[PDB]
Amino acid sequence: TLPPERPLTNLQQQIQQLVSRQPNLTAGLYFFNLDSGASLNVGGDQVFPAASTIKFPILVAFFKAVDEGRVTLQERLTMRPDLIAPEAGTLQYQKPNSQYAALEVAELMITISDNTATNMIIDRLGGAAELNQQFQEWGLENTVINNPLPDMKGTNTTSPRDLATLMLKIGQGEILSPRSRDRLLDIMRRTVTNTLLPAGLGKGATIAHKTGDIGIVVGDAGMVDMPNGQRYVAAMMVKRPYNDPRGSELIRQVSRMVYQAFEKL
């Protein structure tokens, strides 16, 4: 039973000030503390290229199909030539039409952001339109798969609010069965890219999250448990000049600010 949003208006103003004084960076972020209801929303509703953050909603859809018996964890998925994609991933180095357990593929999609793995999962789950439908059903108003991954062009979209709100639902025990939820969270704690939201967290904090980076956009979203007992959801996306390190640094800084604010309180 959740508390109502209570905007941390002063910290929101500080974050707003910070994200707008750097040229050619456009940020959006949404944070929500499950205990205090304290919230931060600075451009959180705005639509952004999803980059690999989209793989999080896809993972939820994978486990839903598993819950519903439509997919099993050990069934074999084929890496068809049409699904193979460059950029992040290890499956692309394997022989085309080799096969992998559905769970292994869903895992790789998140842990290492495997693009071939992602396209395999999207295909197995009925394609982009089918998944877009599901995203709408979960209330994800701006989360849309328009093209296969890696989608470097950035045609796939989401919003910080969409991502955080999905994680909030999952954190609360909605959508997925207990078994599927816990496995999803396990997988989202074993990702290899922890240079954004986690880099602003204090010692002892844990985070289930998924990053996305396509050069023109960088972002991350997840759920943090703090050693003081508190829990919050977090999502931030930054449009930037191609590969600008300022964008990644700005996420670390906002992450830090928020974490330290929740510690004070």
Nearest to 125 by CA among 155, 97, 145: 145
Does 150 sit behind a cis peptide bond, omega within 30 degrees of 0 on the bond before it? yes
Give buried/exposed letters for 231-244 (b at 16+ CB in 10 A, else e): bbbbbbbbbbeeeb
How far is 170 from 173, CA to CA, in rounded Å? 5
| Amino acid in position 220 | D
Chain-centroid distance of CA 122 in Å reads 16
Task: Give the long-range contacts of residues 186-190, CB within 8 A, separation 24 or more.
Answer: 187/59, 187/106, 187/107, 187/110, 187/111, 188/56, 188/59, 188/110, 188/222, 190/111
Tokens of 225: 């448990």
**209 within 8 A of 190, measured Cβ to Cβ:** no
Closest CA to 175 of 134, 131, 234, 122: 134
Question: What does the angle CA 49 – CA 34 – CA 264 come to, to the nearest 5 degrees?
Answer: 100
Strand ranges for 34-82 from DSSP E = 38-42, 48-49, 76-78
Residues 241-249: contacts with CB under 8 Å, at least 24 apart: 241/24, 241/216, 242/215, 242/216, 243/215, 244/24, 244/25, 246/22, 246/25, 247/25, 247/217, 247/218, 248/195, 248/196, 248/213, 248/218
110 within 8 A of 194, measured Cβ to Cβ: no
The residues near 258 (Cβ < 8 Å, ≥ 6 apart) are 11, 15, 31, 40, 200, 232, 234
Q: Are 113 and 105 in contact (CB under 8 A)?
A: no
Q: What are the φ and ψ backbone dihedral angles of 32, each rounded to 5 degrees?
A: -150, 125
Phi, psi of 125 (to 5 degrees): -90, 5
Strand ranges (DSSP E) for the chain? 6-7, 26-33, 38-42, 48-49, 76-78, 99-101, 157-158, 206-213, 217-225, 231-239
Q: Which experimental technique did the depositors report for determining this structure?
A: X-ray
Local structure of 221: helix, strand or coil: strand
> Is there a contact between 146 and 51 (Cβ–Cβ < 8 Å)?
no
Q: In the CATH hierarchy, which top-level class contains the domain 5-265?
A: alpha beta
Measured at the alpha carbon of residue 230, what is the angle toward residues 228 and 232, in degrees to the nearest 5?
140
* Contact call for residues 47 and 74 (beta carbons, < 8 A): no
H or E segment and range at residue 131: helix 128-137
**Is the CB of residue 15 less than 8 Å from the CB of residue 254?**
yes
**What is the SS3 assignment for 247?**
helix
Q: Is 92 exposed, middle or buried (0-12, 13-18, 19+ CB in 10 A)?
A: middle
Enumerate the domain spans of the chain.
Answer: 5-265
**Torsion sign over Cα 240, 255, 252, 116:** negative
**Resolution of the model in angstroms:** 1.9
Closest to 115 measured CA to CA, from 195, 52, 209: 52
The answer to whether 265 and 35 are in contact (CB under 8 A) is: no
| CA-to-CA dists, residue 37 to 5, 34, 209, 265, angstroms | 5, 5, 20, 12
Cβ contacts of 77 within 8 Å, gap of 6 or more: 99, 100, 101, 102, 105, 120, 121, 124
3-state secondary structure of 19: helix
Sign for the pseudo-dihedral over CA of 248, 254, 259, 264:
positive
